[PDB]
Amino acid sequence: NLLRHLKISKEQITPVVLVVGDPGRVDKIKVVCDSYVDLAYNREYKSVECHYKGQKFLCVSHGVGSAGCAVCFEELCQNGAKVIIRAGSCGSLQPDLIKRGDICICNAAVREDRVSHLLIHGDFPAVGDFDVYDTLNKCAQELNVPVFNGISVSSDMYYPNKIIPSRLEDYSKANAAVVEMELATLMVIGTLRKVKTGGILIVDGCPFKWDEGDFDNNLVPHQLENMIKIALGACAKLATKYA
Amino acid sequence: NLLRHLKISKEQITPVVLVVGDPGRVDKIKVVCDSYVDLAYNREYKSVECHYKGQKFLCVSHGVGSAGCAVCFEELCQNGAKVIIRAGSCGSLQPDLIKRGDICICNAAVREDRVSHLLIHGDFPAVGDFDVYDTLNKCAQELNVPVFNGISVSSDMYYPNKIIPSRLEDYSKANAAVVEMELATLMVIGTLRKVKTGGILIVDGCPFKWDEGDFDNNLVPHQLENMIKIALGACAKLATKYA
Amino acid sequence: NLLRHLKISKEQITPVVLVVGDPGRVDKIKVVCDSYVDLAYNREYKSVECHYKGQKFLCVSHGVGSAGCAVCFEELCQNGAKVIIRAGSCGSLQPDLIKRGDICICNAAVREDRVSHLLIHGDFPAVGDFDVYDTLNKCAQELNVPVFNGISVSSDMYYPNKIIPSRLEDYSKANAAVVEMELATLMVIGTLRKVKTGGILIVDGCPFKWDEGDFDNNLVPHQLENMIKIALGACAKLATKYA
Amino acid sequence: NLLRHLKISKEQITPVVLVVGDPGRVDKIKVVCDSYVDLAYNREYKSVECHYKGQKFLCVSHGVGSAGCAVCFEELCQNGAKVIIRAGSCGSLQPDLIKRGDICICNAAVREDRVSHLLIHGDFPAVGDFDVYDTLNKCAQELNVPVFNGISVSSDMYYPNKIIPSRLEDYSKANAAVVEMELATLMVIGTLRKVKTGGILIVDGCPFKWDEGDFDNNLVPHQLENMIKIALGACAKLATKYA
Amino acid sequence: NLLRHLKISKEQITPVVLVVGDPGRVDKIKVVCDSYVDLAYNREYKSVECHYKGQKFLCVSHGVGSAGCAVCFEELCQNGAKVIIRAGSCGSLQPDLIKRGDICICNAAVREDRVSHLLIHGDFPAVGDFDVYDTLNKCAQELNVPVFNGISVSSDMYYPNKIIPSRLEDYSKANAAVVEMELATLMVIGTLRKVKTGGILIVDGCPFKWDEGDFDNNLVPHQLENMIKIALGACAKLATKYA
Amino acid sequence: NLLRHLKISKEQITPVVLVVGDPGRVDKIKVVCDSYVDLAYNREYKSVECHYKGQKFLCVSHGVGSAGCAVCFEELCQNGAKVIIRAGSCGSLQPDLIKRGDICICNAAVREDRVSHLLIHGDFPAVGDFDVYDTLNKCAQELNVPVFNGISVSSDMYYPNKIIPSRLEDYSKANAAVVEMELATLMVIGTLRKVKTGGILIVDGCPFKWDEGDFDNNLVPHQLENMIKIALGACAKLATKYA
Ligand SMILES: O=c1[nH]cnc2c([C@@H]3N[C@H](CO)[C@@H](O)[C@H]3O)c[nH]c12
Ligand SMILES: O=c1[nH]cnc2c([C@@H]3N[C@H](CO)[C@@H](O)[C@H]3O)c[nH]c12
Ligand SMILES: O=c1[nH]cnc2c([C@@H]3N[C@H](CO)[C@@H](O)[C@H]3O)c[nH]c12
Ligand SMILES: O=c1[nH]cnc2c([C@@H]3N[C@H](CO)[C@@H](O)[C@H]3O)c[nH]c12
Ligand SMILES: O=c1[nH]cnc2c([C@@H]3N[C@H](CO)[C@@H](O)[C@H]3O)c[nH]c12
Ligand SMILES: O=c1[nH]cnc2c([C@@H]3N[C@H](CO)[C@@H](O)[C@H]3O)c[nH]c12
Structure with a gap:
């Protein structure tokens, strides 16, 4: 019994899962793990079981956009996932403080999508788990990697137009980080x-x-590598609790 | 220079473009053409230039979800594309009439997304171009493939929860077909x-x-084949004019 | 029995109906038909059975405003009408392309009213029927009357204020024609x-x-006549199929 | 210059205006006054200068619907009118108390339209003038005509559908009277x-x-006569004040 | 039994209740009456029974803010109160007409709160009872205390921020008085x-x-005294009837 | 000068502030500290400087309701406060798990108010600071006091009615704790x-x-006491950072 889009089974899903937007990123990440096992690749959802520091956890891509990643998240969540961490890129909303190559660990986000609203009233907050947040920060510290922390604006609109103003400036003034x-x-x-x-x-x-x-089309290797080590470090630590 | 996510050039974009959701579908579609030229494959965006009935038109995958596909559409729209036809799967909102395998050509849709709203007020109608709609129907007729016609509900939520009621039933009563x-x-x-x-x-x-x-994990072979035939034919006809 | 406001009977309703705003316009149209038969006149609703090219179809006024015309359309739709075509005046939202006297056939509209929303969620599209649209265009073609095609902004506010800005400018930019x-x-x-x-x-x-x-208090004489011809023509053609 | 719809000049507008919905109603009232002067009749807008108790004031019909009557009200307000009292019919939302033929004078109203919202934020109250309200109740008293007082739900939807629930029950619970x-x-x-x-x-x-x-297609004759006397009376009193 | 927050029993509640925001304003009011009886003081809620002009009535403080006062109004309304008149301070939205120290008797308000919306749809009006409104204006007149009349904007935001514009300017244009x-x-x-x-x-x-x-940290003494007399006067006339 | 409502000077504001709802509560809190200095008491806002564990910090009451507390919070934030910890009571939304007397430390909340929406868009999350959250949790641990963690629904309606449904059951289902x-x-x-x-x-x-x-009219004594110790200890720790 495979999941409609992930094409993996309930038993293949681990308690901890690292999600990235691009299926290509998963290939590049698994290779930095101790070992890995490819599970499936359907549409833009590539799943690969990773092994890092004696721990077991999947790495699944979710594609661009909220509607598409929701399919991924729901399938993971409704079939065993216990901890899901997202690793990806973002834009800065505080240009004088947070710049290219910088890494930010977010604890909450602005719900500028539709799916979450079709799931729960707008007043409900989009907030991450403190522990996941704390572990990500501690791993960064142990790897001597400086990072920022803050709220992320999760908007469904990448290319704004000139009729309806973007809410990005509002959120910048509101202190959203990225x-x-x-x-x-x-x-x-x-x-x-x-x-x-x-x-x-x-x-x-x-x-x-x-x-x-x-805008950088490609990230600086060293930097992307650091964020990945942090993410992998965190998943490993969080997975230990379910081993 | 290339487009941020498609990774092709402004000159590589044909006036007509057939968009699909699964990047794998682009491969299955290119082979059925007279000849093709793979252009690029970034994230879930595969771009192949198709050759059918002496015409040139691209076939691009946009991934699952509106926010992710809007990225694809914007890059196409802002770089030459004059016509874009989506060919994909859907669900039936009129079970006593439209069943698995049936084909529907839509001319309007329910804007249950967020990106379109971030572009213009919700009162604005999501409606297709008449000629494109008509061209798709004439091809279905010439090929002797019966099809339905109607409004499609474009919703960002694939897996509903038990808290906020889905609007599918309401739209079904409102006569939305798919x-x-x-x-x-x-x-x-x-x-x-x-x-x-x-x-x-x-x-x-x-x-x-x-x-x-x-629910079918696999589309009905002959029906899928006919739909793709209708799409390619329609794309070929429309492409002719622009050439 | 009689319909509450149109004061006509269910049996008096023809499958095809032509609706105008001003009840004084229904009289001017009946006189250009082969023959007519006055049915009723209550409030702003004047109903007349028009005879044109061997076809019978009603011509009913609906008054200014969405809420009032809804009362008229609901009684028509719930008592037999199968096709309804509105013919009236409008303002141009593209002053560089569409000027006074020009005629436009619309296939969709912006729901800047309240009745539609009291009837169905705002995400639902306000779109007209394909055949009807096609018919009107072909009839215009046969009469060699050049016409525009586009979206119409249906706003409940004719006279704007200075507190809440008009959305017309936004819609003009969104490419709505009238x-x-x-x-x-x-x-x-x-x-x-x-x-x-x-x-x-x-x-x-x-x-x-x-x-x-x-702004013209009086419509361009010949242009108005042409529109009426196109309208009467489309009604005649559609009424024939239903008979 | 004549107003666009009312087709009367600015100097033809008296400080006090009595507005009814049916243009036929304006004729049945003018004859009940001492004398009168037919001013104009365009679309559903019929204007007549009424003479009652030595006072002068217009009686203009506004047609069915918020958007339609707004065109009427705006033209009057922006051209002289100081007082406008509407007298029309309604339905009871309190069936056990308010019944057929009963008269209700309203001080406030539910904004279930669109034009008001296109003019100012929804939080703004739809409330009438205390003095007008007061003079109406006193004219009713001097005529020994019992009346009810309360809030009127002004809804753009007359004929409800079965998809989106009507809010009428809700407002009845909220104590709206009519x-x-x-x-x-x-x-x-x-x-x-x-x-x-x-x-x-x-x-x-x-x-x-x-x-x-x-429901009554025709209002209770005598009850209708009483309401109109109360209205004409109120109009006369206020007109005097504005003399 | 005692109301949860007011800490008084249903039998201690009179048909007429005068509410103020500051519990300190309650003590300053009771000593201006012929006599009084302290009832209770919990949180920001201070209740005292007032004896003025041979009439009995309570004076309760409701604190600052719509949510806090709703708790107060609800306990009073669900336990006997028939009349509640608020007497407090406000800012002017018409600086060219209404100045510091001026008194205004309001018949309606803008619902820029949240509690009323969680109680009834936003379209519903916030309107006061006419008799109460008239009783206040007459007491003012009898005391030869000139007063303004108009709509009050009841906003949950006292200190605006620079991201989302305040709606006060819009309401001033809309003619809200205070x-x-x-x-x-x-x-x-x-x-x-x-x-x-x-x-x-x-x-x-x-x-x-x-x-x-x-801005005045302390209200104009004589003026504050006049308003308090108008209020107590009104409360007396209204309490008289019920007695 | 003094803050308009709190009646204390900017210089009297300490970097860390403990806020509560009932002014009566701040007097019961200062007494458990080492020493204290009363600063002011205006309306429902009582301010006292508390000295605890070699540190200083204010304890201020904000009263019942979001609009009321916002006044307090704004005056504090705009005048030097760096950390503000709310210690209050709440209702349980998970009766089978969280019961009376239980303590819950919250890191996020549902924005069922108006003020926050008047400062920024609804999509913005209401999330607390991680350090504060962790500090509170750590203090709980040290004192061996078991506590729950979760999202709080902050609603402006204490007493719901029967017209508009309460959203509490929904949030209970969405997993909000209190x-x-x-x-x-x-x-x-x-x-x-x-x-x-x-x-x-x-x-x-x-x-x-x-x-x-x-429902308890009186908080479980030992449990209330335990919560206060946790709050005082957290304020002390956090104030150290600003000493
Ligand atoms: O500046 C930006 N705005 C919006 N999204 C992104 C991203 C992330 N990358 C993807 C789009 O390239 C998408 O998954 C988004 O979450 C990076 N930079 C930005
Ligand atoms: O029943 C359905 N509901 C929602 N989407 C789809 C689809 C299409 N397939 C994709 C998700 O598998 C997505 O691109 C969607 O547009 C097929 N059937 C359904
Ligand atoms: O510029 C315009 N704005 C809004 N409505 C109209 C109309 C049409 N005429 C009527 C109002 O005169 C109304 O029925 C509307 O549909 C013509 N021109 C305009
Ligand atoms: O029950 C009712 N519901 C809504 N409108 C009306 C009316 C009034 N009469 C007109 C419709 O017949 C319209 O102008 C409306 O305001 C009477 N009874 C009712
Ligand atoms: O300018 C003003 N804006 C908002 N509220 C008030 C008030 C009243 N005083 C209190 C706030 O100081 C609150 O109860 C409010 O209703 C006085 N002046 C103003
Ligand atoms: O069940 C409850 N619902 C809403 N608020 C509260 C409270 C807190 N107590 C106050 C209302 O009594 C208010 O400050 C609120 O935050 C305790 N229990 C509940």
Whole structure:
């Protein structure tokens, strides 16, 4: 009995799961683990069992956008997942403080999607699990990797238009740290399904300055590597609790 | 230079574009053409230039979900595309009429997403271009493939919960024929960007009966084949004009 | 029995109905038909059975405003009407392309009313029927009357204030062609009551330039006549199929 | 210059105006006054200068519907009107207390329309003038005509459907006394334009019991006569004050 | 048994109740009456029975804010109160007309709170009881104390931020006269619970000019005294009837 | 000068502040500290400087309700406060797990208020600070006091009615642990003003079971005492960071 989109089975899902947007990232991550086992690759959902520091945990891609990652999260959550951490890139909403290559560990997010709203009233908060957040921060510390912490704007609109103003500036003034497209959806589904969520992101630019060239098409190896070591370090530590 | 996510160039975009959800479908579609030229494959976005009936039109996958597909559509719309037709699967909202395997050509959709709303007020209608819609029907007729016509509910939620009621039943009563996850976004973006759009779908089940086993993990072969034939034919005809 | 406001009987309703706003316009139309038969006149609703090219179809006024025209359309749709085509005036939202006298056939509208929302969720599209739209266009073609095609903004507010800004500018940018006050309501009511709908309009000005005198109290004589011909033609053709 | 819809000049507008919905009603009232002067009749808007008790004031019909009567009310408010009292019919939302033929003078109203919201935020109250309200109740008293007082639900939807529940039950529980289609609109435009407003209504049924036949196509003759005298009386008193 | 927050029994509640925000204002009021009886003091809720002009009635403080006062109004309304009149301070939204020290008797309010919305749909009006409104204006007249009349904006936000614009300017244009923090909540709860409400306020500054020093930490003494006399006077006339 | 409502000077505000609902409660708290200094008592806002474990910090009452507490929180945040911890009571939304007397430390909340929405869009999350959250949890551990952790629903409605359904059952299903009236307001204002917030609460009942007598008028003594020690110890620890 395979999951509609993940195409893996309930028994293949581990208590801890690391999710990334791009299926290509999963290939690049598994290779940095001690060992790995490919499980499946359907549509944009690539699943690979990872082995790191004596721990077992999956790495599944969820694709771009909230609606699509929700399919992934729901299938994981409703079939055994206990801890889901997202690792990806984001834009800066505090250009004078957080810049390209920087890593931010988010504890909550703005719900600028639709799926979470079709799941629960807008007043409900999109908040991650403290423990996942704390473990991600401690691993960063142990790897002597400096990081930022804050709220992420999870917006379904990457390319804004000139009719309806973007709420990015409002949220910047509101002290939101960064902007991406999945975290809020992950957090809300997680709390509704009693699954611990977290999120660590690396900055690839600032949407306020895209027209100025404030955007990297590719991340600096060293930096991306650091964020991955943190994420993997965290999953390993969190998985130990369910071994 | 390449487009951020598609990874192709402005010159590589044909005036007509056939968009699908699964990147694997693009492969299964390219082979059935006279000849093709693989262009790129980034994340869930595979771009192949198709050759059919002496015409040139691209076949691009947009992934699952509106936020992710809007990324695809915006990059196409803002870089040359004059016509975009979505071909994918959907669910039936009229079980006593539309069953598994049936094909439906839609001309309008329910905007149960968030990205379109971040673009223009919700009162704005998500409607396809008439000619595209008509062209799709004439091809279905020439090929002698009976099809339905109607409104598709484009919802960002695939797996509903037990707290906030789904609006599928209401829309069913409102006479909406089908339910999927991207059309409404395509139409709205098309209208704003002045790009003609249309959509044709093949039913894979009925969400009101998933619990009773009404769902196909695999689309009906001959029906899928006919739909793709209709789509390719329609794309070929429309492409002709622009050439 | 008689319908509450139209004061006509169910048996007096023809499958095809032509609806106008001003009841004084229903008299001007009946006189250009081969023959007619006055049915009733209550409040702002004047009903007449028109005879044209061997076909019989009613011509009913619906008054200004969505709420009032809804009362008229509900009684028509719930008592026999199968097709309803609205013919009236509108303002241009594209002053550089669409000017006074011009005629526009719309296939969708912006739901800036309240009745449609009291009837169905705001995400539902206000879209007219394909055949009706096609018919109107072909009839315009045969008469060699050049017409525009696009979305209409149906707003309950004719006279804007200075507190809450008008959304017309946004819709103009979103590529909506014109603006009037009843099309969206007709469309939604029809989709709900399985009644084919459509609309054709003649421009009497541009709300963006009213203060500059850009507005006609009287419609362009010949242009109005052409629209009426197109309308009567489409009714005749549609009434034939139903008979 | 004539108003766009009313087709009367600015100098033809008296400080006090009595508005009814049916243009036929304006004729049946003018004859009950000492004398009168027919001013104009365009669309559903018929205007007549009434002479009663040595005082002068217009009687203009507004048609069925919030959007329609708004065009009327705006043209009057922006051109002289200081006081506008609406007298029409309504349904009871309190079947055990308010019944057919009963008269209700309303001080406030539920804004279930769209134009008011396009004018100011929904939080703003639809409330009439205390003095107008007061003069109406006193004219009723001097005529020994018992009347009810309360809130009117002004809803753009006359014929409800079975998808989106009607809020009428809710408002009945909230103690709204009556239901009609124009009062809230008049009150909001009025406070915004600094025009005093009020309304008197006669009950023709109870929408909760329409299916049982709790409705009258024709109002109780004498009861209708009383309400109109109260209205004409109130109008005369206020007009005097404005003399 | 004692009400949860007021800590008084149902038998200690009189048909007429005068509410104020500051519990300190209660002590300053009782000594201006012929006599009094301290009832209770819990949290910000101070109740005292007042004896004025041979009539009995309570004076209860409700604290700052719509949610806190709703708790107060509900315990009073669900346990006997028939009339509740609020007497407090407010800011001016019409600095060209209403100044510090001026008194305003309000008949309706803008519902910029949340409690009233969790009680009834937003379209419902926040309107006071006419008799109460009239009784206050007449007492004012008998005391030769000029007063203003108008709509009050009851907003939950006292200190605006720079991200989301304040709606006060919009409401000033809409002609709202004054702004405070509990009137609309009292009115709505009142209408729902069949309790008659009213409100008399004294201006302590204008929020549009706080940055220019337009604010009084202490209200104009003589003026505050006049308003308190108008209130006690009104409470006496109203309590008289019930007795 | 003094803060408008709290009546204390900017210089009298310490970096860490302990806020509570009942002013009567701050007097009961200062007495358990080493020493204290009364600062002011205006309306429901009582301010006292507390000296505890070699540290200093204020304890201020904010009264019942979000609009009321916001006044308190704004005056504190805009004048030097760096950390604000709310210690209050709450109702349980999980009667089978969390019971009366139990203590719950919250890190996020549902924004069922108006003020926070008047400061920023609803999608913004109401989340507390991690350090504060962890500090409170660590202090609980050291004192060997078991506590629950979870989301609190902050709702402006204490007494619901029968027209509009309460959302409490929904949030119970969405896994929110408890319900109170001011935490979401504090969190939002904190994030906007760059002030670290937190919240610890003691259960006094279950709103789902009030009708069955599931409510304590008096908080469980030893449990209340335990919670206060946790709050005082947390404030002391956090204040150390600013010494
Ligand atoms: O500046 C940005 N805005 C919005 N999303 C992203 C992302 C993340 N990368 C993906 C889009 O490239 C998507 O998954 C999003 O979550 C990186 N930078 C940005
Ligand atoms: O019953 C259905 N509900 C929602 N989406 C789909 C789909 C389409 N397939 C994809 C999800 O498998 C997604 O792209 C969606 O548009 C098929 N059947 C259904
Ligand atoms: O510029 C315009 N704005 C809004 N409505 C109209 C109309 C149509 N005419 C009527 C109002 O005169 C109304 O029925 C509306 O649909 C013409 N021009 C305009
Ligand atoms: O039961 C009712 N519901 C809604 N409107 C009305 C009316 C009034 N009469 C008109 C519709 O016949 C319309 O102007 C409306 O305001 C009478 N009875 C009812
Ligand atoms: O300018 C103002 N804005 C908002 N509220 C008030 C008030 C009233 N005083 C209290 C706040 O100080 C609160 O009860 C409010 O209703 C006085 N002046 C103003
Ligand atoms: O069951 C409950 N619902 C809502 N608030 C509270 C409270 C807290 N107590 C106060 C209301 O009594 C208010 O400050 C609120 O935050 C205790 N129990 C409940």
